[PDB]
Amino acid sequence: MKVISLKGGAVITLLPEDKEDLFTVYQIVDKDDELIFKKKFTDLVKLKIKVISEDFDMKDEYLKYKGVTVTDESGASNVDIPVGKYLSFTLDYVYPFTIIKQNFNKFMQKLLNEACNIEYKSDTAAVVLQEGIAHVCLVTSSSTILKQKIETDVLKFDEKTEKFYKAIYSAMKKDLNFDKLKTIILCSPGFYAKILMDKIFQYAEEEHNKKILDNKGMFFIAHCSTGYLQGINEVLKNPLYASKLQDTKYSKEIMVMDEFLLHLNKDDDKAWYGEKEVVKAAEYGAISYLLLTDKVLHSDNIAQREEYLKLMDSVESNGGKALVLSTLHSLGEELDQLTGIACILKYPLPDLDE
User: Fold this and answer.
1) What is the number of alpha carbons within 13 Å of residue 345 lying toward its C-beta?
2) Are the CB atoms for 228 and 128 separated by under 8 Å?
3) Residue span of the signal peptide, if any?
4) 193 by DSSP, 3-state: which?
5) Domain 250-354 is of which CATH architecture?
6) 14 - beta bridge partners?
């Protein structure tokens, strides 16, 4: 993503760069917002509309806003174009547009800002190693960009192995961002990947590096024919691997949705759902984990989402954390089945429903 300018409300001029940015745009543009762009029906012309509805298909890489045109007295658009007609805008990755936005919030601003960081984007890191070489890597939305070229029986200790590993190790916690990643792949022709995996978790407890130890489930071990850059792509497109590329991607959400029901199924009073019950649990300050969907926070009810934003800070300003789940995926679709809002508590709050 690229934000050209940006100057309550606001005026955002921005450029979506891939389908991951189309989704970002999706959660920002609101009904009644206004949109300056270019269309043709070299006969291109600058148009402008008040948004009315949306057509979104991430798989199809398709975002379209339907709306009616409006007066732009700056003449800077809608020239010769009669005000009041129907007109739509299909997003393209080529020309930027401007959003005259009314309720731009810090949650939206976080997402947009994050989308711009071409690091914060990439959420899959690799490490490929033949029997002597390793590559700390970063899988980007197009390229498998390298971060650091490091260099029988393969199962027995050695001083030049246990030096080598700690190198990969460090080179990783240096060249990599475990906050913004969701998946880390270790793949190797041979035992090398597995060996690298444990050496990693070995040194972790030495440093007590809970940034890695907390996420033992973002790591994925794989085989590939060569320990060169080739390997990454054998795995990415290997179907017997696909499902479990997802299980690691959502390691955290998978874990959080777990405990939520652990409590919920023990008729346990430590887990709840419903706008009502969660706002109350917030009054006690008892929330360890707030669970919201992306849908409920970009609701049409602009009133209702004022509440939920407060609830997010409120909850964290109090030593609890928050989690936005995508209704485009199983966990979000499930949290959906529960009104897109629920929580986990620090203690049992009997009868928050009475």
Assistant:
1) 23
2) yes
3) none
4) helix
5) 2-Layer Sandwich (3.30)
6) 3, 97
